[PDB]
Design a protein around this ligand. Structure first.
Ligand SMILES: COc1ccc(-c2c(-c3cc(C(C)C)c(O)cc3O)n[nH]c2NC(C)=O)cc1
Length: 208
């Protein structure tokens, strides 16, 4: 059972801009994804302060970066709050329509693509480096779902058939052929140190 949805026109336009604009500083995608993971981790941490049972689906709050050269994928896993199916469909928990309008106006007022996170839509920067993105998520109040898109105006949602995640979100970046530097350990370490050095959860870079 796979459900196919059209992106709202504004989101499709954001994705097209990201895909088509000449912009060399692509490495910021990682900071954006890691920031989203941190925000999700903050949410479960806060909820757990008053209801510890919310951690029954996993006590550890962390971020894992998993390169796979054989599959040409970089995977960002977190044990944050997760998203419901409804939130996945509704632009992955983001205020994407309003954020996109603001980002577009800013780009006219001198901003650059690296500022995308100021507009709540940093997730879509994944398309700087990925031909396809799969987001697998589990929230305590819902089942495990997989969202996926190769852009082109549509996305799919299905009940996930992979390994259970307990709680959290996994973003799988199916990298463009010319973007394989983002699978290299030294490159990933450099980017995390540059842009994500103060994130308040352990970031573990897996090796191959
Ligand atoms: C800035 O907008 C958002 C929107 C939603 C989340 C979010 C994620 C989550 C979302 C993404 C993207 C696919 C959007 C990701 O890369 C990693 C994540 O852990 N899980 N749970 C939540 N929910 C709350 C309340 O954070 C984070 C930031």
């Amino acid at each position: 059972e796979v459900e196919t949805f059209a992106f709202q026109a504004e989101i499709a336009q954001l994705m097209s801009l990201i895909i088509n604009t000449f912009y060399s500083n692509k490495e910021i995608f990682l900071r954006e994804l890691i920031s989203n993971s941190s925000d999700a981790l903050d949410k479960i941490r806060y909820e757990s302060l008053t209801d510890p049972s919310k951690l029954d689906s996993g006590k550890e709050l962390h971020i894992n970066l998993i390169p796979n050269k054989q599959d040409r994928t970089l995977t960002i896993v977190d044990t944050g709050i997760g998203m419901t199916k409804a939130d996945l469909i509704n632009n992955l928990g983001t205020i994407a329509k309003s954020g996109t309008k603001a980002f577009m106006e800013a780009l006219q007022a001198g901003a650059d693509i690296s500022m995308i996170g100021q507009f709540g839509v940093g997730f879509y920067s994944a398309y700087l480096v990925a031909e396809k993105v799969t987001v697998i998520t589990k929230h305590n109040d819902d089942e495990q779902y997989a969202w996926e898109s190769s852009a082109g105006g549509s996305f799919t949602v299905r009940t996930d058939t992979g390994e259970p995640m307990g709680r959290g979100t996994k973003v799988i970046l199916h990298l463009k052929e010319d973007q394989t530097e983002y699978l290299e350990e030294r490159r990933i370490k450099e980017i995390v140190k540059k842009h994500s050095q103060f994130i308040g959860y352990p970031i573990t870079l897996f090796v191959e």
